[PDB]
Design a protein around this ligand. Structure first.
Ligand SMILES: NC(=O)c1ccc[n+]([C@@H]2O[C@H](COP(=O)([O-])OP(=O)(O)OC[C@H]3O[C@@H](n4cnc5c(N)ncnc54)[C@H](OP(=O)(O)O)[C@@H]3O)[C@@H](O)[C@H]2O)c1
Lengths: 145, 76, 554, 48, 48, 96
């Protein structure tokens, strides 16, 4: 998929293990509790899933570790990555305890569902951590079981 | 088309006469259809809801029920 | 009396759409692991709330997860996909359709037991006679022999239908008909004025009406029209769509708490007050709304102290203020705020008592008062607010209420003020006289004697039951009765026939405490006699060695 | 443990207790009689 | 004249002429006259 | 304080009561549930809460003083108006 105009690097990396966007189960969000970063994140991951082909009705469990840990400026991504590798090995998708009441804005993101409590599943196949930084510094990593 | 918010309300406070014209109209509307046009005029609500409460509550909905529309079928 | 209300601490929960897909996706896996077995009433309940929040978008999410269910893996998976597609279909036919409070729980009763070791425990065992709520509704409405239609109540209800017959059969001269109700009224008045010279069942749950001589006498007409809806609720449920309501005293695990969830399952927006506004308390009410909040519903929690005049007027304002408030108008008011003033006779009405009385009466009235003037001023003329007055059967019959009875009794003057004073069409009064609710609340230690007292052919209630009953008087049928006439509503388990109830209880109270004490006493005695006879050594070496749990870090 | 279950297990507590410095291992005489295992870091006392 | 009430006696003697008049008038179906009697008896029981 | 003066042997007038006639009361005319004001809350405290406490005080006095065989007759001034009349304002509530 290296430089293929007809294959999104997301598709690629996933398909090489025999998976599609639909297998992408959990997305760990930067979700820093700031007004804009949380709209944006959903919006990006959403547009991503949509345009790739994600089949309507199949939502990604969205994780927001920051509620528990706070935002360690630099080590943010590492903590989240740990979380996912941990979800991967337990099939447990932790909930956002501090999800008072999700912003009505987040309704328009069909492909994302924000769990306020933990959910034990039959398993998760692949995940997507995504972080953003000062000075237009956006990164994303996809991990597979 | 020329309707504007709070129209003729200034003249309302200033003229004891016009004062009463509005009142009698409002008094009517409130007791029969369950809303005030004076309110609608002063502060233009993007929505408003009437309630069919007790004794005088039910009598209102009666008037809403007794609204006779008429459209004939293409057979007559 | 220290104010505690602060608009900045207000928490609004309204995100039903998300909690849906959660509780949905949550149930799916629940089945696959068997946390939910097809049996469990639970699943039913869950499904109904998922029905209550029915979006188009919910269906899409509902569907996909089903469509791809790996049935070939196990029964559970099949069982899931089944119940899944099942639910999805139901959800389809209830789009737009008002959400409903429907209590599918398994009616439960009280059961205290004394273990052979003297251990006293109290479970809540499924009622052997009822399984759905419909059964409860019936069981209630039917009656108990213990509530045998009294002489006067019989003489009356009979003479009633005598007139109803004689009357609605027009072929007798109006000379005689006219002269019948003459001799009829005579009988009724004489009965009322001097009963002493002249002279099937009663619900467990009945309304009443006032006599010419202000008496609250059992009215079948109402008790009917009520109980009817009460049954209609147990069946096809009951909606509160579009209604706004204020509730105080909705603490965790209280009657209010249940009633809350009730209205939350209808499309009801309610503002709940807490005098112990914590994170924990914040979270609790979230937990509720996450699982009860039907489409259209809204929960707004807020700190508040009904002991504070200031708070009262402040609260009310937040509620009505268009600009910076949450600009509502109230449909229900459920003033269940209350303090345990246990332990005091007129002997000693202390600080607490005076305070309690101020929460439970003076400020309560002021709470209603505030709401009224709000409506009056705001021109809200055609939308009376139904007040569920929590009245009591105890008007000094029980011991150390200490200013309790005084409050609960006083409240009843409202029955008349509704007529005399000028707030009739702003507030309506529904005097719910709540009966024994064994559910962990203001009658907790009264559970040991719960089944005992019930032995005498009378009934005690679980909270979910009482909430049901109350939500009943919340139903449209009754609400309209209130708009023309205050409503009495005896929701006492017919304990109106067990006299000296406090004596009975304390009697049972004793026995249970006594027989258990003896039992465990002896145990010590005898196991101590053994140390005397077999020596410390023999006895010591022969006791169940119960390993102490350690921890290993694997 | 915290992110997932919402509270610590005894195993968790022991780890936390260890790193926070509340308990430390001991392997010698405690008040004359020998002992090995967890000890309250503050008081020389043993902990179960 | 306001606090007027009738003795048990009057209550019966009034129940008498009510029944006597309504009955010796025979205008009612055997149903009504049947259960009118029915109801009358109950009343007369409870009142002794 | 009153009650104690009444019973104190030494410096009080060392009585024991046979009758108690608690007719203390304030005109709270003019107020509906509309507006239970300062006056009303005060009136209710004179007419009920402190009334009960007056009785209560007397009782404990007797109990403690061994006055066992001389009950004091309390003439409770109750009312026919339990909210039937207009602007009692907390009046009925006390009397009931
Ligand atoms: N259960 C029965 O048998 C029975 C009988 C007759 C009447 N009732 C009525 O039922 C209603 C509900 O009480 P309950 O017996 O179900 O339970 P409860 O244990 O008496 O509940 C009392 C609740 O009132 C709130 N509260 C306490 N102090 C307050 C204050 N100072 N200001 C504002 N709120 C305060 C608390 O809520 P927070 O924790 O959120 O602060 C608390 O959870 C009461 O009105 C009671 O009189 C019940």
């Amino acid at each position: 998929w290296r430089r293929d105009s007809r294959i999104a690097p997301l598709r690629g990396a996933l398909a090489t293990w025999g998976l599609t966007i639909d297998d992408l189960g959990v997305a760990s969000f930067h979700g820093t509790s700031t007004v804009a970063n949380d709209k944006n994140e959903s919006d990006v991951i959403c547009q991503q899933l949509k345009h790739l082909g994600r089949t309507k009705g199949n939502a990604v469990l969205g994780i927001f570790q920051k509620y528990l840990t706070g935002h360690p400026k630099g080590a943010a991504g590492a903590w989240m990555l740990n979380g996912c590798l941990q979800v991967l090995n337990t099939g447990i998708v932790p909930g956002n305890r501090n999800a008072d009441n999700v912003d009505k804005v987040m309704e328009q993101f069909d492909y994302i569902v924000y769990p306020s409590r933990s959910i034990k599943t039959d398993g998760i196949k692949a995940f997507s951590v995504t972080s953003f930084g000062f000075g237009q510094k956006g990164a994303q990593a996809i991990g597979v079981h | 088309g020329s309707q504007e918010q709070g129209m003729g309300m200034d003249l309302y406070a200033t003229s004891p006469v016009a004062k009463e014209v509005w009142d009698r109209a409002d008094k009517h509307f409130r007791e029969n259809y369950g809303f005030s046009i004076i309110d609608i005029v002063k502060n233009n609500p993007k929505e408003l809801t009437v309630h069919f409460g007790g004794p005088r509550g039910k009598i209102i909905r009666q008037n809403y029920m007794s609204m006779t529309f008429e459209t004939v079928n293409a057979d007559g | 009396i220290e104010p505690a209300f602060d608009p900045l601490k207000a928490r609004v929960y309204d995100s039903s759409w998300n909690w849906a897909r959660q509780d949905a996706l949550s149930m799916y896996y629940d089945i696959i692991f068997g946390r939910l077995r097809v049996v469990d009433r639970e699943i039913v309940s869950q499904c109904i709330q998922i029905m209550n929040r029915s979006n188009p978008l919910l269906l899409e999410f509902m569907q996909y997860h089903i469509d791809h269910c790996p049935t070939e893996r196990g029964e559970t998976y099949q069982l899931a996909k089944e119940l899944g597609q099942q639910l999805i279909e139901n959800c389809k036919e209830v789009l737009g359709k008002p959400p409903v409070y429907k209590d599918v729980s398994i009616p439960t009763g009280p059961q205290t037991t004394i273990d052979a070791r003297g251990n006293i425990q109290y479970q809540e065992v499924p009622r052997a006679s009822a399984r759905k709520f419909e059964h409860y509704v019936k069981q209630m409405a039917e009656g108990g022999p213990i509530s045998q239609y009294s002489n006067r109540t019989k003489v009356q209800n009979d003479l009633r239908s005598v007139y109803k017959l004689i009357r609605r059969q027009h072929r007798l001269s109006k000379s005689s008909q006219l002269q019948f109700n003459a001799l009829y009224k005579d009988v009724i008045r004489a009965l009322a004025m001097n009963e002493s010279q002249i002279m099937e069942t009663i619900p467990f749950l009945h309304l009443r009406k006032k006599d010419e001589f202000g008496n609250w006498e059992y009215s079948k007409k109402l008790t009917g029209i009520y109980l009817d809806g009460l049954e209609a609720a147990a069946r096809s449920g009951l909606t509160f769509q579009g209604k706004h309501a204020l509730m105080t005293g909705a603490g965790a695990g209280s009657i209010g708490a249940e009633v809350l969830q009730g209205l939350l399952s209808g499309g009801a927006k309610v503002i709940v007050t807490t005098s112990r506004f914590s994170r924990q308390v914040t979270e609790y009410y979230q937990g509720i709304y996450a699982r009860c909040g039907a489409r259209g519903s809204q929960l707004v929690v807020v700190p508040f102290n009904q002991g504070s005049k200031q708070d009262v007027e402040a609260l009310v304002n937040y509620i009505y203020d268009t600009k910076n408030g949450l600009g509502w108008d109230l449909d229900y008011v459920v003033p269940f705020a209350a303090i345990p003033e246990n332990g005091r006779e007129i002997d000693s009405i202390d600080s607490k008592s005076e305070l309690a009385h101020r929460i439970m009466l003076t400020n309560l009235l002021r709470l209603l008062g505030a709401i009224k003037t709000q409506k009056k001023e705001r021109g809200y003329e055609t939308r009376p607010a139904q007040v569920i007055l929590p009245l009591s059967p105890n008007h000094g019959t029980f011991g150390n209420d200490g200013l309790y009875s005084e409050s609960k009794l006083a409240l009843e003057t409202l029955f008349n003020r509704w007529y005399s004073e000028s707030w009739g069409n702003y507030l309506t009064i529904c005097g719910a006289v709540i009966g024994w609710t064994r559910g962990t609340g203001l009658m907790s230690a009264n559970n040991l004697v719960a089944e005992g007292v019930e032995k005498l052919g009378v009934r005690t209630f679980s909270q979910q039951e009482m909430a049901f009953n109350l939500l009943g008087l919340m139903a449209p049928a009754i609400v309209n009765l209130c708009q023309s006439d205050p409503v009495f509503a005896d929701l006492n388990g017919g304990l109106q026939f067990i006299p000296d109830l406090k004596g009975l209880m304390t009697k049972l109270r004793k026995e249970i405490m006594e027989t258990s004490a003896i039992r465990q006493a002896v145990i010590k005695e005898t196991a101590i006699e053994n140390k005397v006879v077999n020596g410390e050594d023999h006895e010591a070496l022969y006791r169940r060695v119960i390993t102490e749990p350690r921890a290993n870090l694997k | 443990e915290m992110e997932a279950y919402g509270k610590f297990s005894l195993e968790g507590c022991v780890e936390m207790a260890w790193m926070m410095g509340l308990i430390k291992n001991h392997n010698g005489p405690l008040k004359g009689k020998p002992y090995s295992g967890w000890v309250d870091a503050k008081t020389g006392e043993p902990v179960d």
